[model samples]
Target: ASMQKLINSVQNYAWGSKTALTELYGIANPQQQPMAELWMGAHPKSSSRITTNGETVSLRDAIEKNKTAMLGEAVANRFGELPFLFKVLCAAQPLSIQVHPNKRNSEIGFAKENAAGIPMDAAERNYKDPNHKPHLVFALTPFLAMNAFREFSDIVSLLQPVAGAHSAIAHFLQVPNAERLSQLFASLLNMQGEEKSRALAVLKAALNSQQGEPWQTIRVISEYYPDDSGLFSPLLLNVVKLNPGEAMFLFAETPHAYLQGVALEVMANSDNVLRAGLTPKYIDIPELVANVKFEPKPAGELLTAPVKSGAELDFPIPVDDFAFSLHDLALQETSIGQHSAAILFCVEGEAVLRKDEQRLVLKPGESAFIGADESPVNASGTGRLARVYNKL
Candidate 1:
């Protein structure tokens, strides 16, 4: 009775792939909707529905009804609601180049916008809620993304040959440093009229250059956002290609963009976003520049290494909001311990989970909500399942 079956919601976004959800998770999309994310958590915006005693109830309502029992005493005391949101993200086109603010800045921005009488759903609004979003993307396929800032010298070198074509690049090279990176970013984003077009043209020329991966990304981005300032992001940010089962953590204030791929993403319970570019969405140049960490992030530091224990590969997330792990199930039963409320998502094959007399069989794309009281849950089968719970 403690193990409740969950029916999650799929978000239809323009950048989503039409067939990825249907092909990967067997989700039906007869209308050929561009399914972007399969959300499976108690987020206020779109909480999953769970069946209990033949009655389907909102997960958010269920957790609120019995906070201590559902979220555990420690979790209930720490966070009144679920601290993290779990999602299966499918990106066919490039996502907006953006940065997420840290906790302090988030609260400030939220309050400032609120005091200014900006609606929550306003297109020009920067912060959605007063919560920091630290994300971890676990690649189920070859995931390509632009993450963090590259070394100053590297960026300067890349722009050196093409600087003459664009004034922004030329201006950046004149006084290139960590502080000037914000200036460079802002200049590119703020480019308007002929200047933005000129910058795009300069980048278009670089697409034929020997810049390799960065230009390859630019080429792809140009197809979707030819006039967008995000086309120059590949030159500024580090390009990363994560293989299947590989994972990466995106810290707050870091500029990143998901190019194309399917992945399991977990983040703090918030939707706050400051766009840099790549879409028609509102771009808050000064805000995004202020929030971004202008320091260089090395390629090696992007991927998160998992600590393998028994059948599980636990990703060591520094944040206390959420912890994630992938379980490799076999024919023999394995005990999967749960400390707080958790969501179990089956990625492949089938797994039978049991706690006492409570039994639940999870097939591909199926997920379950295990309450805090459900401990020492046993699992047996041949498949891969991801477990998400509070780090506490």
Candidate 2:
């Protein structure tokens, strides 16, 4: 099969240069300024456009022009649309702890908002599309994330050691179950003016009261963002610490926040996020609660499989919307199965991509697209490389 190759540009900030990190892997850089998407799929919003020499061409154009050639009839038979979006995300600060609605819920939510005459760009608009998003994050470094709340009894154990903790502990102890934590989170989101301020103050004071080792980490977070409502991290979510090469998968309606560090993130090709807290984005607690699944499960237990190649790990979601495999190709060579499209972004070293007569050399902060026609794209490099593709 003949595959079309495309390059995407990155958007950078004080946190990290996404383009630079991606290019270090094997993908091409985008030509547009402020190119935020290293998009490799058929997403209508920011699909990667193929370029030959200096000419720019849309990926959708290429697909429409040669669907059978790009996606063999056999592979195309297995999936309807290009199902995923892939990228490298670096979060220097806490991302909003949020949840997504399942497909049925999302469809209804979107229709309700539209019928209510809510503008598409309204701050309160929660559903942008009728798609459920399930994601996986493979860490490039030591990463800390807040995901789902802890079990009710565990929260009680954590709260027991702090100074003046008895009252707060008693309050939670009386609540009785994980649903209580969800209710408390919903209550905090709905609280306003002085009430919200007062609640966070109490949480802050309680976190600061203990200097013991058990409370040491929470104490540090409280000091950094003394007034930030996420200080309630202890109460609302479980903190997951991931080592290099480790991964976590999150399903639709699972609330999460990437606290710090860099990772390879892959999800269904949608940008709709319903934020509850820890961001400057508007908080719609009602919408957030409606979308969330209140199960109290541990975050560290999400990673599922290892690819046949020892260097690559696979995280598969229940639905075929997306599937991601991450690899750290330091001084090693790897091969990826052909897909409708795939994004190969580098985080640390240089990588060489070869597909028949086409060869792409990627440096730090660059990315390239591999069209479906390109089968068995061969990757050989020294340094870290993360590969993302859809499931068919």
Candidate 3:
């Protein structure tokens, strides 16, 4: 079999930036529609298209039509469909404060929703697929994210400067240690219209009165989502700032939100999301609460540590379904060993991918799928490349 260049689909979600990927990919985009995600994979809902033998068809259809040959015997026996979805995501506004279910929980929730007769397109439906979504983001530009909660003492000290003796946050600090954080979250999110307005008044004045990170953060989050309870997240969660090339991975049940910037995203081929706040979408508070890890992450755990492999850097992932990695080449060449499938993406410069005599040149923002049967493929040229493939 030969390598095939992919024709990808774009998601113009409201939170996306208007000029994110349109110019990069040399594609047409309306002035009004934001270009959120450039999806490359077979996720059923929005799978990429491919041309095989001059025939254009959806990636999912191509896979099912030639299962073993298309996916390789090992992968077809395990995942059947493509195990990972790659994306170029540009967020102009804050994404929803959300959590995802772990593997076993996802399977159970998907089955439960199906049994309950929840339609796939229903507004209130939670789970969208049987597979879990554990994703990583590698920042292309400066990135900001509210990832997980901060320590209780840290938060208390933070709010003391803002809310002082009668701090609403300090009031909930009275609960038992295990319940304090959760209760505090509940109190803030449980607020009604007047309560929210009153809280926002005090919060805005207190935070804006300051001049450091607190004030700096509000001016950014407020422009998009004005009265969102999640705007107070700089104090509630670990406000992470990632410079170019830095990476962060969010596991299942991690409460997080992408506040800004463009990045390359890779995840299990699933769409199930349980939103908590900062959204107009349906929120299932109890579900989000039950799914999240109540305590903050031990620092450094949120960012993925790179495992050096030859010239490439592999994001150390514990999952069995997929592996995400990065490769940067400057007028050099790199090669990967035999694998079931490789979705190779070029985000900078140009490169030529080869398997024996056949070859394909990939320019910036272009990608292709290389089959396992192709002659041990090698890439040579200049630019940065991201390789996504099955690990199982």
Candidate 4:
């Protein structure tokens, strides 16, 4: 069969929303563990499995054996693997204050580590793979996040109101654009024993006085990760709220963190994360700082609108490894365009996928994998699905 039902994996992290998985997917026999992310494609760490004949095979293995057939000759020759990994992410608390390295930096760092004899599985190792991780998130609910930076004027205003009271907050507004953020972040994270405690006290006191916005965001962080200087680190960034059907694309070298909510995320198949703060995991400070894109993007520019109303509108991004879009067809047939390979996830209601003589039925929370050489796929359903494929 060219079309197969997928069996995916769930990642349990401390900050995960346990209820979202079951609420969205109707998961049965959920373990006590928090469900942070549901991974739906091939990655070395955890690959989705598919039903073939009377047996089950891992998506990664299937790709390995028949790269060209599964991914098409062009994509197989280019990426040499599945280009993207799909995920359902639920963050009950803010994820780590982190940045992803661009492909060049990633490859450079990876080679350096390998030359130094650092083990791939080492906790202190920086790069897990030599690829850039550029991803986008489409909100299923009201989603909250801090993506990139706030504008110079905006940052000034947010800090100016409280700066006179706290030396730390005041210091942020004094410096120029990129330098201002670099120093502020370096100072806060590198603060010494009592220095950190003192800064936190001053910031919290000012926060109470301010009582809103940039200040409230700080309070929220403190509520979850108090004593972590990262609690105050997001003060320089912008707060992004995505209503349902809204999406934001964030690329490598961009600093960001998901604060809360459930969303669908698609990205290049790599797990190379450089965390600066808010995480107890290994923090690669210098590296994280080196890779961060300090420029700010306005809120208007952050949310992307569908290119077409009735057609399968594409989510615009400059990356070649993956193409992403939403198909909200309800009891209507939406045409699936020709692509090298594709993964369709039925995130809501029930949907049926048809191509040539092949057909697939996907209930809510289920997904299907289509082959590269598969015939035209059509979906007539009462559900919503996200389609991901290679641009070529």
Give the winner by lDDT. 1
lDDT of 1: 0.86
Q: What is the lDDT of residue 181 in candidate 4?
A: 73
Show the colliding residue pairs in model 3: none
Off by over 4 Å in 2: 1-5, 12-43, 71-81, 117-123, 161-171, 211-226, 280-282, 310-312, 327-335
Q: Report the lDDT tens digits of candidate 2 across residue range 86-183.
A: 76666654556778778888888878888999987777777777767677777776777777767767776765543132233355567757566666
lDDT of 4 at 180: 68
Q: After aligning candidate 1 to the native by TM-score, how far in Å is the CA of 52 from where it should be?
A: 2.8
Please tell me which predicted candidate would have the highest TM-score against the true structure.
Answer: 1
Model with the higher TM-score, candidate 1 or 3: 1
Candidate 1 structure quality by residue, lDDT tens digits, 32-62: 9899999999978789998875888889999
Task: Quote the positional error of residue 351 for candidate 2 in Å.
Answer: 2.6
- Scanning candidate 4 in windows of ten residues, the lowest lDDT window is 160-169
lDDT of each: 0.86, 0.63, 0.76, 0.79
Off by over 4 Å in 1: none
Shift in Å, residue 282, candidate 3: 3.7
- Report per-prediction Cα RMSD to one decimal: 1.6, 4.3, 2.2, 2.0
Q: On a 0 to 100 scale, what is the lDDT of residue 30 in model 4?
A: 56
Clashes of each: 0, 19, 0, 1
